[PDB]
Amino acid sequence: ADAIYAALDKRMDERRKERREQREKEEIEKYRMERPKIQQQFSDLKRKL
RNA sequence: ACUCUGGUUUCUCUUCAGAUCGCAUAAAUCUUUCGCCUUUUACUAAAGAUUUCCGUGGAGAGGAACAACUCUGAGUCUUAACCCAAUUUUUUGAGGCCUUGCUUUGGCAAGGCUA
């Protein structure tokens, strides 16, 4: 019963799941160019260790 | 008046949604400006960006019901009584002859002769 209800809730989420998830993927990358990850900013220095 | 064309309704599913998805209209979250400010949870009201929800359209697919009933479109869209021709063709007076030029000859070109 729990699996049935969980699958039902997941199915009700498929209306815009892929659309909003690809928008999120295309939105963090827009933010990532201006604000890179902290570990990335130290990648060249880390390599020299 | 000929022949082929071949639905409508309903229940699901999968996707795409420009368009007033919707001649209607909610909520949440985030970031800014405020309003309350004393801390949550509620909020104040504008802007901006999201998400969810109540619904919607198109197309595709699969079942069911009325599957048997006809459409539309296309195809050549197919018939005789009595009545008719001076602008294009079954009633239309448009005939012939000759000259000279010219063509390897045939013929052609122009003019003349009519009745």
UniProtKB/Swiss-Prot annotation:
Phosphorylated by PRP4K during spliceosome assembly. It is found in: Nucleus, Nucleoplasm; Nucleus speckle. This is Pre-mRNA-processing factor 6. The modification Phosphoserine is found at residue 43. Widely expressed. Identified in the spliceosome B complex. Identified in the spliceosome C complex. Associates with the U5 snRNP particle. Component of the U4/U6-U5 tri-snRNP complex composed of the U4, U6 and U5 snRNAs and at least PRPF3, PRPF4, PRPF6, PRPF8, PRPF31, SNRNP200, TXNL4A, SNRNP40, DDX23, CD2BP2, PPIH, SNU13, EFTUD2, SART1 and USP39, LSm proteins LSm2-8 and Sm proteins. Interacts with ARAF. Interacts with AR and NR3C1, but not ESR1, independently of the presence of hormones. Interacts with USH1G. Involved in pre-mRNA splicing as component of the U4/U6-U5 tri-snRNP complex, one of the building blocks of the spliceosome. Enhances dihydrotestosterone-induced transactivation activity of AR, as well as dexamethasone-induced transactivation activity of NR3C1, but does not affect estrogen-induced transactivation. It comes from the Eukaryota. It is linked to Retinitis pigmentosa 60: A retinal dystrophy belonging to the group of pigmentary retinopathies. Retinitis pigmentosa is characterized by retinal pigment deposits visible on fundus examination and primary loss of rod photoreceptor cells followed by secondary loss of cone photoreceptors. Patients typically have night vision blindness and loss of midperipheral visual field. As their condition progresses, they lose their far peripheral visual field and eventually central vision as well.
